[PDB]
Amino acid sequence: PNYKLTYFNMRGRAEIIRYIFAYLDIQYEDHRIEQADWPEIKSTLPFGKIPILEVDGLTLHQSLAIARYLTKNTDLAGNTEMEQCHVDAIVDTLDDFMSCFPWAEKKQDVKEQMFNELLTYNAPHLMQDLDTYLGGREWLIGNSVTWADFYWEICSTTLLVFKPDLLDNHPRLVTLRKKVQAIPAVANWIKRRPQTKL
Amino acid sequence: PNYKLTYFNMRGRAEIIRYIFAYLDIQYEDHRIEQADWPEIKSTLPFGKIPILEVDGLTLHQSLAIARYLTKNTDLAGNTEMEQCHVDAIVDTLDDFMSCFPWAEKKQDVKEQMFNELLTYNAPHLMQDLDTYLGGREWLIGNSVTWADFYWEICSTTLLVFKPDLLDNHPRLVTLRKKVQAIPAVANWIKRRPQTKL
Ligand SMILES: N[C@@H](CCC(=O)N[C@@H](CS)C(=O)NCC(=O)O)C(=O)O
Ligand SMILES: N[C@@H](CCC(=O)N[C@@H](CS)C(=O)NCC(=O)O)C(=O)O
Ligand SMILES: c1ccc(-c2cc(-c3cc[nH]n3)on2)cc1
Ligand SMILES: c1ccc(-c2cc(-c3cc[nH]n3)on2)cc1
């Protein structure tokens, strides 16, 4: 099929889809929009949010819903029904935290204060829960890479921009990130992608 | 398998799971806890949050991850991969909205004001989006019921507690609520479930 991903010039919520496309060696158009053109585009969308993915003229929305669509019946999904459940739960746990940030807040002082709070007060507990959960496994779920591992590397990348010391007490989580980054198709993408703060 | 669902005595985030069990005619234990027992149970949970589902002694977390797990390989999931993407996207859209509400706000005036704001601006906006997305079609996705329709009925039921006229201008969304409620397994459940505000 012919793929067109539309999002802002950011890793943000589209990056998961971009890692999946890279790892699965699928070609697509990486369409990035400027903020000023967002109002026009937004007004033409059923739910007025991005990312969206067009597949042969059919518009799909919701970043995680798209990621599950693309990973279904590939080695990136869980190896069993229950593993699939753990993949989705780790993703959801990560998403629940990232969703707390007021990404679109216009008042800068209120925005950074909110960011500071979540990063200082909430992030360290997620890291603990994640670390303990990882236990002695090589990957978050089962015996091989899943898109939950990709989501972890993506989310932590952004958390580290704001809070570089986040993983100082979590070498096992630092190792997980490196393992994802060392995957040749993901490594190539990380190397090739437009460098953005977020 | 033996299934044990644990959550508060409330519809809340466990309800979608309860609807699915009912529809699929899968027997389970509906374990409802009290406040006083929360700290002890919480400490035992990897991510310290409920609902949790124990399957043959194996713990699963994240309500939507669980819901998707239970609907796997059934007509409730969406019949084809692409329709599954849409079921997932609608669920996510609804969950994104419900998450805006300060459910745990202890200052009654702030809670009243935020709810009213959300129900004055954001809710009417979403309802218009969902209404045009549903169109004159029977169900949200495809031509048979999915857990996205269940989730709409569930989410709207809780919103109707705070804005009883929320759907007065959306007869098509009321009709969808009625179609869901009237599914025999669902009608049965609604009648015998414990009565709670939320
Ligand atoms: N849960 C949704 C969130 C989508 C979302 O809120 N996207 C933001 C950008 S990351 C957006 O469209 N913001 C512009 C706006 O809300 O008008 C998803 O994962 O796709
Ligand atoms: N997104 C998660 C939310 C889990 C969650 O926040 N659970 C709440 C109850 S609705 C909870 O355990 N809060 C009390 C606490 O964290 O101590 C899900 O759908 O399962
Ligand atoms: C999960 C992963 C990433 C993100 C995210 C959202 C944004 C953003 C910035 C301006 N607008 N939106 O940046 N990162 C949100 C959830
Ligand atoms: C979807 C459906 C329902 C809910 C929800 C969460 C709550 C709640 C009340 C006190 N604490 N939490 O009530 N309803 C959230 C998302």
Swiss-Prot record, chains A, B:
UniProt keyword list: Calcium, Cytoplasm, Fatty acid biosynthesis, Fatty acid metabolism, Isomerase, Lipid biosynthesis, Lipid metabolism, Magnesium, Metal-binding, Prostaglandin biosynthesis, Prostaglandin metabolism, Transferase
Mutagenesis / variant outcome for changing residue 95 to N: Increases PGD2 synthesis. Loss of activation by calcium or magnesium ions
Tissues in which the UniProt entry reports expression: Expressed in a number of megakaryocytic cell lines but not in platelets. Highly expressed in adipose tissue, macrophages and placenta. Also expressed at lower levels in lung, heart, lymph nodes, appendix, bone marrow and fetal liver.
Domain GST N-terminal residues, every copy: 1-78
Stated role: Bifunctional enzyme which catalyzes both the conversion of PGH2 to PGD2, a prostaglandin involved in smooth muscle contraction/relaxation and a potent inhibitor of platelet aggregation, and the conjugation of glutathione with a wide range of aryl halides and organic isothiocyanates. Also exhibits low glutathione-peroxidase activity towards cumene hydroperoxide.
PANTHER family tied to this protein: GLUTATHIONE S-TRANSFERASE, HEMATOPOIETIC PROSTAGLANDIN D SYNTHASE
Subunit structure: Homodimer.
Protein's name in the database: Hematopoietic prostaglandin D synthase
Organism: Homo sapiens (Human)
Gene: HPGDS
